[PDB]
RNA sequence: UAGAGGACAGGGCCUUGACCUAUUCUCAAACUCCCAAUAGGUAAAAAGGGCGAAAUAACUCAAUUUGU
RNA sequence: GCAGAUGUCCAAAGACAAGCUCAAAGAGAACAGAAAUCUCUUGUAGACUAAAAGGGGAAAAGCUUGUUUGAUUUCUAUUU
RNA sequence: GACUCGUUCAUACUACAGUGGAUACACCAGAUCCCAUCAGAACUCUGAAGUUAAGCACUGUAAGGCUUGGCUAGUACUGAGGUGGGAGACCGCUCGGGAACACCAGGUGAUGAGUCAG
């Protein structure tokens, strides 16, 4: 009969990896986590309670409600016509902050600079940025020592 | 200087094979022997031709320090006139030897108990073991620090007067 | 004679962390003492550490940081001697009194010693800290539990039980916890040893007579000292090296080290 | 699969196969130190972001400012 | 299609805390030898964890002790 | 010159060796009292005669391991096109992406908060 549970075809995705077994750092129990925050899900199979399903392995979402020991979160997932989001809750070993949105933050505050010193200065400068282009021509300076020949080799 | 040779403990074993009376009788010879209440030991597995059964009690056995080991020991090696093989001492320092009947040792017979042999075994160190079994920051011995087998039979020599054979 | 510590053994190792490695830090105990509610945050679950050294005992505040926690506050036995305690700083009453220090000082800093003061000798909501007892192992009589009683005495709160004070297994009597706390067990052993083993009393007690404390004024000097505490907790206010440390040597001069050796190997 | 080098049985100081140490020919849907190409997921600003003051609370905090 | 398992079992094999460290090998000790008890040295798990197979686990999730009945009454947001 | 609490979790581990003792960390001297055992070995409590022997710190070894770079190599594989070659099994071309073992060489740590002593 046809083997469908709740932690089938787990073998390689939920253990650890090698030379790194064992139980998570004191510090993991030191981050932060605010409501609307982006956050990764990874399980860690050395705690076993609030271990998140098969799916949602390596996904990202936002977060809707904050416990003791428990974070709920907002993913989507697709289903056969439409995306439907679903609320996925897990304990706090299972959660990283999310790192996908790290240049929007850095750009933002780097930018917010420049736009005060050009307004300073009743300036008109572009911020966004810019889609690798074509290059203008030089003038490559070579002697003529430097030039090798190469030709096809013979088979051997 | 204080790195001397020493005797850590002196362990006595008495190996009766059976439950039952023979052991207690076996028990007390050890406790008029030691001043000590011992402890008994429990058989690990199952074997027909010995009749031995799991966690069955089979045997009894002490272990001492200090003033009242040393003279023990000079008990024992009184009865064999410091006499000892080679090949007694392990290649980590320790030595022992045996006794065939418990009354050479100086107790009086009696119709009830019979005969009793023991075991003697000595597990020489010098100072500074606690550090391997401490709690807190256990740790190693080096290795010049350890003994070996001829600084247990030298020490033998100039403590004993000892013969090897 | 098959060798186990092989090739093959060293390349699937796995280290354990360092301080465990060290036999320092549980790493079970300590997460759990440092884990507050994440829906809680910006609250920082303050603790108590203690440990006790050969010849001494210490006393912190910490704070659990993401980059290395930060100590609030500090007090060692040693400072006792200002405190007019001299030797016997190991003691039960040498705890209670390290605990006390703590404590008083801690409020100082924060200009809160005078709205919490305590207890006067011994027969708002307080700040809040957790006890941390290392490695050792909790028995009755151990002499961590002095030191919570001393900032307990002081104006901290530290939740404790109390069936761990010396004597009291199964009930709590509070007079054999103040003969400990006024180091009146070293009294009585000073006076048993006396009678017989006269030497004996001259060589256990060396750093006592040197010094002229007698088996009869001990109690009343750890009496003053706490007063003397409660009146002033404010802290107080390159070497020669004659031996040397070597260096470490690089791959140029490692090669003519084995030059030399087979030369000289060669004649 | 095959030799090489070392310290339990074999008639009376050597068969052989052992045991150990470096090598050697050949393999795995239900083996793995390592590990692609393709195929996936989140993000890329105004019902919002930043910054400074206040007002409400039965929540939180040692804190009628601690914070939220 | 391939190699297998389920209609059970457990007042502890459920809860919490503390202390401890397993398989195996070598060398030593009266009867005792291949196998009985005892000491030491090495040991990243080669043991154990009710039952198929996969994942997890070393001051523990394994071993031994002490105290117990959260295997309790009621409701929500939800995953497969 | 030393210490407590941490971070990284082997450049930090393992084997064999050399050097060190102002304060400090240890080994150490004991068992009346709290406490603990077959056993004051361990645990717990009270000390200050002796020592760097060991723990610990710093170094060494054509050391094992670990770690970074070169090379292996545009090799092995592979996304798109083909009224391409070949009886087939298989293999080139056009527009693209691109490893792993082994071998050679260099290294064997760095760091946060607080405290003590001359
Ligand atoms: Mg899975
Ligand atoms: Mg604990
Ligand atoms: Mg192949
Ligand atoms: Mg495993
Ligand atoms: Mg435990
Ligand atoms: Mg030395
Ligand atoms: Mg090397």
Known sequence: ?156 | VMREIKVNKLVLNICVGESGDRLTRAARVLEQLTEQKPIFGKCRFTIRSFGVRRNEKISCFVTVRGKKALEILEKGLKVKEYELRRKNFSDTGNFGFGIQEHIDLGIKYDPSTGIYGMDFYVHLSRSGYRVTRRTRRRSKISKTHKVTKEDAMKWFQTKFDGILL | VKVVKNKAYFKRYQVKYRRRREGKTDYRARKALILQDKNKYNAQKLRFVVRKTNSQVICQIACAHIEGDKILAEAKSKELIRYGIPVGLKNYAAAYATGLLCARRFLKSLNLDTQFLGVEKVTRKPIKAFLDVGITRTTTGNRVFAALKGACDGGLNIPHGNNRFPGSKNEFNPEQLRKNILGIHVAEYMKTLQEEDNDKYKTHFNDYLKNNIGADDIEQMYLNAHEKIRQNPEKESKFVSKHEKPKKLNAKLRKKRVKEKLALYVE
């Open chain 1, 1 to 156: 009969g046809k083997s469908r549970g709740k932690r089938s075809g787990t073998r390689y995705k939920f253990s650890k990896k090698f030379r790194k077994h064992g139980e998570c750092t004191a510090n993991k129990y030191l981050e932060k986590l605010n409501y609307g925050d982006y956050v990764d899900i990874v399980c860690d199979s050395t705690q076993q309670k609030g271990m998140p399903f098969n799916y949602y392995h390596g996904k990202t979402g936002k977060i809707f409600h904050i416990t003791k020991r428990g974070v709920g979160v907002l993913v989507n997932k697709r289903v056969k016509h439409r995306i439907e989001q679903k609320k996925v809750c897990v304990r706090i070993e299972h959660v990283r902050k999310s790192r996908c949105n790290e240049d929007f933050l850095l750009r933002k505050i780097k930018n917010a600079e420049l736009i005060k010193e050009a307004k300073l200065k009743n300036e008109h400068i572009n911020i966004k940025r810019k889609t690798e282009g074509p290059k203008p021509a030089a003038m490559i300076k070579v002697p003529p020592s430097k030039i090798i020949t190469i030709e096809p080799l013979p088979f051997y």
